[PDB]
Structure formats: structure tokens, C-alpha cells
Ligand binder design. Structure first.
Ligand code: YVU
Ligand code: YVU
Ligand code: NA
Ligand code: NA
Lengths: 333, 333
């Protein structure tokens, strides 16, 4: 049912336009494909979830002999219009349907896609990307090739305090003759369980990031159902740790060069922004302390993830945790 | 599946808070119940879709002997907390579940609810409100008692022109080596099929409104599957008619007085705003002409309506039409 809502959403030209207006996303994919044009020239390509078809056009710009553009939403009909209007019906073949269900007439040299969501994994499309390797020749490549999830402890009492302010409605002991205040705790708890999608000043980061790498050439679809990221941070700053900040990079590892698409808060902003998950209660750390714990991502039936975080300051034993739902993010930007 | 998404959405305190922050909505419901307190005192009440429970508290404020508060979402657990904290467990009974499936131990004197969506009918909750009359005594009442949908022709070339501007991305004949322009027509057509939720200056209205009344005491659940609203407008202004504007009123017809909740653009703004549906092409009308046609609402499987509009200027024969999806509104406010 969540899957019906997902494909309906991506069938709108307005949504495809929104994503295509991210100039870092467009420019980095085009650079990755075209700087590596020798990897595409005279090759067979699969574009998984082609949307508008623009990655298939970039593969054609690089001289690919045949591109299969697979799309499950009504967007497949719009991609076919662009293939005809750009005079590329000899080299781009649009296949309507799910990459899990369609028939390709041949194996491919390289798979291209944009399957990344918030915190890399949101919307679970990387599972369809990995599934598509059933069509990849043993010698074949995938663009993107690897994904790096970064997480770092942050300090931000303004974000922490806002969770209480947003619930101010429920604090009212006398609203049209009703005491609402018994729900203040539940309302604040609900806000704390929303991952925060926005950007921030890099100075809120209190330690160098921990990196978790997924190699898309090696990973199996089932690997992404449960993602466990242990961490030990070497604290560089003293203050309250309010939670963990997340971002991701992908690398396109070509024969000619490796091209990175970074969503780090040190890099130009993208439509992925960054994601912050609060602890239920902040932890005091001094520079030189270690903050250890685990971030566990469990895939759910709403095409998203439940996020379990636990952290302790090793030197004091101070600990906190949270359980968040990436289906219900707070868009704070 | 749409129904799962619907009940998940209303289970969040953040959504209930959003609705409860509409001071016209809160104040008008409280006034309707309490000015008519003699209708509630010592009576049995059913609150359909109680959310936070606040209408059940208003019924208790009016001296109701017993209130059954029915709620299908996880909000039922929060309403029960408020009933306990307000010391009303003797008079308010929270029943978790769908009003279509639960067991009430007795018939009720009056049904109260807030079942109204955009354009009155959006989200299809009025069908559950009417269903609940299986529990109403023959002598019983419903608050609200009637609903009036208003529609009027409007002139607004800024809104019409925006539909083209919003698609400017697809006009590009050279975007990273791709001609996008063959999709400009499809993108503009998609924007025209989105009902526009916003408010506007009353001077864009070119005729007195046509009123379509639903009497909730008489209406059957099945009546709302297909709603056909013929119209003939007596044009008061000369210019291009770009579409139809919609709003609604509900009346609470008590023994002591009738209280109105109006979402008209002459009245203080509410969270319902107003809704505008463009024609595919504008119609020139002069003052004294008549604009005739039909607005047809067909309920769909996404808890919303397909909106078919047809209109002609009687004096010229100029005609236009559109088919819109109220599931995909443009929030322009
Ligand atoms: N199992 C599946 N089988 C088939 N289609 C599936 C499956 N899972 C998801 N989908 C579709 O995947 C799309 C993700 S959104 C468009 C991304 N591609 C895009 O913008 N390409 C152009 C571009 C330009 C520049 C830079 C990057 C990308 C949607 O249309 C889904 O309907
Ligand atoms: N078949 C159904 N059975 C049971 N519950 C159902 C069904 N269909 C929908 N629902 C629920 O109905 C609510 C609509 S939103 C809350 C409206 N009530 C509210 O604010 N009351 C307080 C208030 C205060 C002031 C002014 C007006 C109202 C949701 O919680 C749904 O989950
Ligand atoms: Na807590
Ligand atoms: Na048209």
C-alpha cells in the first residue's frame, strides 16, 4: 500500500522537476558519466527508475550503444516523449514496470540510477538498485559504485529547546475549559522521535565523523533490511551532545576517474540537506572523552526505517537513547 | 491502503494541534454546543472521530449525562489521558475503533463531529458521520446539522499565468544537452488539474454564489459517492472567467439558536481556506451574461474526489472544462 503511494508520488512531473532543480545532483551525475565516457561508449546500460530519463540521455551523450530505461510510475510515458523528441529511439528503450518484474532482452555492462533518499537509505530504492544486478555482466560496473554514511555528534540547544516550544499548545492548563497539560509529555516525546531534515553550521559538530560504507557491487538486497553502525567518537569539543548528525556521499568509480556526490555540511547544499536525530536527553562530554554506541536502522513496511540510537560518554557512564521514525521527518529548512 | 495512511496521519498529536490552533473552528463549535446547552443537558452524545476529545469536553461542559467518544487512530489513547486528567471518567467513555465496527451499549440523543475537509467533502469522513446515524434515536439531532457548498465564477489572470510559470523548467530546449520542451504541455496540464487551496480578494468573484445543501439528518452515506451540482450564474462583472471558487458553511441547528461556521472569503480565514479550480481555458463573459454548467464530484479510492467541471457562456456558446484531482491540491497560501 505504501508502495502504491510511492509510485503515484513519482508519476508527477512536478516532483521530477523538483529533484531536477538540484544543480549539484544534476551536474555531478553528468560529470561522473561524461568524464568516464570511455566506460559508456559502445556499451549496454540499464537505468533503474529513470524518471524523466535524463541519466539515459547522459549515457547516450557518452556514446552508449543501447540504454534500457526502466520506470514503474506513469513517468515512463513522459520519458518516452523525450526519447522521441531528442531523436534517440535507436539507442534508448523505455521499459514500463518494476525492475523486479520486467524482461530485459540482454545483460548490461553498467547500471546507472539515483536511488538515494534521506540518510542514503530512505524510500528503500537501493534494494531495487541491488536487485537489478541480476542483469549485470560479471565484468560490469554500477554508477554510483559505493555509498558512505557519515554520522557525528552535535551540540545545538536551540534545536533541543524547540521540541518543547513546538508542544506549547499542550502545556495549556485552561483551553476553552479543558486542561490539556497531561499530554505535554506525549507531544514533546513525539517531536523528539522526528528526524530533523535541515542544514546547520559545521561548528555544531563535536568530533570527526564515523563512516559506514556500502559497496553496491558486493551488497545484496537483503543486507539493507537491518543496518547496524557502531561508533566511537574522539570528542574534540566540550559541551552538551544533543544527538547525531547524518549525511552521505556516493562515489562513481570509473576507469578514468572517481567522481564524488557529497551531501556533507562542508559542501554545497543539496535537496538531501542533512539529518539530525536527537537523544531523549543530552550528554555532557569534554574534549578528549569518547562517545560510544550504536545506530541501528531497521527497514519498515512504510518504505522507510526505524532508527534506534544509543550512546554513552565512556568516562562518566552517562547514557541516552532514542527510537525515531524516518517516515515522519521534521522539515525545518 | 489510503485508509491506513489516513488513520496514521490523524494519530499524531502534531496534526491534532494544527487543527486545534484554528480559533474560528474551536470557538464556533464551542459556541454552537454551549449556546444550545439545554439540547445537551442530561442527554446521551456520540462524538464521531473525537481526535483529542475536545468536542466531548464541550458536550460535558453543557451537562451531557454520557458521551461516547469514538476514535480509530492511536489518538484514542491520548483522549483517554485527557478524560482522566479532567476528572470526567464518569461521563466520557472513549471507544477505540471505527464507528462502522464498534458496539455502543445504547442509542444517543445527538451526534457531534468535525468531519469536514477541503470543499466540505474531501477525506470522505462525512460518510462515517452519516453511517453513525444507526445509533441516533428518531428524535435525535446532529451537530453540524446541514452543510452548504458555495461555488462562484472567478477572474484571476495571475493564478492562470502561474500555471505556465511553474512549468518553466520543462520549457528548456537545452538542459545539460537535453531538449525538455516536448513535456511543457504535459507539465502545464498537470498544474491545471490541481485544485488551488488559498484565500483571495472577494473582488475576483464575478457572480453571486450557487448553494448546494446537504441535510445530514436526511442524507445517506451512499449519497456522497457522486455529487452533481448544476449552476447558472448571473454575471455581475465583465472579464475573463478563469474557473470556479468553492467554500462551505455548516449550521448547528439547536433548540435555542442556529450557529454557523462559514469558510467564505468574506469571513475570517480558517484552516480550510477556499478552493479554486481552473478551467482548461478562460471564458469571456460580460455583465448580464449567464454562465451555465455542472460541477460533478466523484468519490475515489484515495479518500478524495475527482472534480469534473464544464461551463459555457450562454450568449456566445464559448465553453471549457477541466478534470481535477482533490488528492493533489496546490497549497498556494
Ligand atoms: N523497483 C523499481 N522499478 C522501477 N522504477 C522504480 C523502482 N523503484 C523506484 N522506481 C522509480 O525510481 C524513480 C526515483 S526518482 C527519479 C530518479 N531518476 C532521475 O531523476 N533521473 C534523472 C537524473 C538526472 C540528474 C541526476 C540524477 C538523476 C521514481 O521515478 C520511481 O518511480
Ligand atoms: N470511521 C471513523 N471511525 C472513527 N474515527 C474516525 C473515523 N473516520 C475518521 N476518524 C477520526 O476522525 C478524526 C478527524 S480529525 C479530529 C476531529 N475532531 C476534533 O478535532 N475534535 C475536537 C474539536 C475541537 C474544536 C472544534 C472542532 C473539533 C481523526 O482523528 C480520525 O482518525
Ligand atoms: Na523522554
Ligand atoms: Na489544455
Amino acid at each position: 500500500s505504501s508502495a502504491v503511494q510511492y509510485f503515484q508520488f513519482y508519476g508527477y512531473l512536478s516532483q521530477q522537476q523538483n529533484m531536477m532543480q538540484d544543480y549539484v545532483r544534476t551536474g555531478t551525475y553528468q560529470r561522473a558519466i561524461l568524464q568516464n565516457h570511455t566506460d559508456f561508449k559502445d556499451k549496454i546500460v540499464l537505468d533503474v527508475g529513470c524518471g524523466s530519463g535524463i541519466l539515459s540521455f547522459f549515457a547516450a551523450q557518452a556514446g552508449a550503444r543501447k540504454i534500457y530505461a526502466v520506470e514503474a510510475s506513469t513517468m515512463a510515458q513522459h520519458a518516452e516523449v523525450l526519447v522521441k523528441s531528442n531523436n534517440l529511439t535507436d539507442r534508448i528503450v523505455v521499459i514500463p514496470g518494476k525492475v523486479e518484474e520486467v524482461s530485459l532482452p540482454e545483460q548490461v555492462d553498467i547500471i546507472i540510477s539515483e536511488p538515494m533518499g534521506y540518510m542514503l537509505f530512505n524510500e528503500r530504492m537501493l534494494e531495487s538498485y541491488l536487485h537489478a544486478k541480476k542483469y549485470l555482466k560479471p565484468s560490469g560496473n554500477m554508477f554510483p559504485t559505493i555509498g558512505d554514511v557519515h554520522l557525528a555528534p552535535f551540540t545545538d540547544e536551540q534545536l533541543y529547546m524547540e521540541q518543547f516550544t513546538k508542544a506549547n499548545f499542550w502545556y495549556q492548563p485552561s483551553f476553552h475549559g479543558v486542561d490539556l497539560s497531561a499530554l505535554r509529555g506525549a507531544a514533546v516525546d513525539e517531536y523528539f522521535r522526528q528526524p530533523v531534515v535541515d542544514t546547520f553550521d559545521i561548528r555544531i559538530l563535536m568530533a570527526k565523523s564515523v563512516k559506514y560504507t556500502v559497496n553496491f557491487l558486493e551488497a545484496k538486497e537483503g543486507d539493507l533490511h537491518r543496518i547496524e553502525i557502531p561508533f566511537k567518537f574522539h570528542m574534540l569539543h566540550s559541551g552538551l551532545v544533543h544527538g547525531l548528525a547524518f549525511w552521505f556521499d556516493v562515489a562513481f568509480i570509473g576507469s578514468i576517474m572517481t567522481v564524488w556526490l557529497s551531501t556533507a555540511p562542508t559542501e554545497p547544499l543539496t535537496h538531501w540537506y542533512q539529518v539530525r536525530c536527537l537523544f531523549q536527553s543530552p550528554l555532557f562530554a569534554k574534549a578528549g572523552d569518547t562517545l560510544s554506541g550504536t545506530c541501528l536502522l531497521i527497514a519498515n513496511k512504510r518504505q522507510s526505517y526505524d532508527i534506534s540510537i544509543v550512546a554513552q560518554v565512556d568516562q562518566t557512564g552517562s547514557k541516552s537513547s532514542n527510537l525515531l521514525d524516518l517516515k515522519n521527518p521534521f522539515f525545518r529548512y
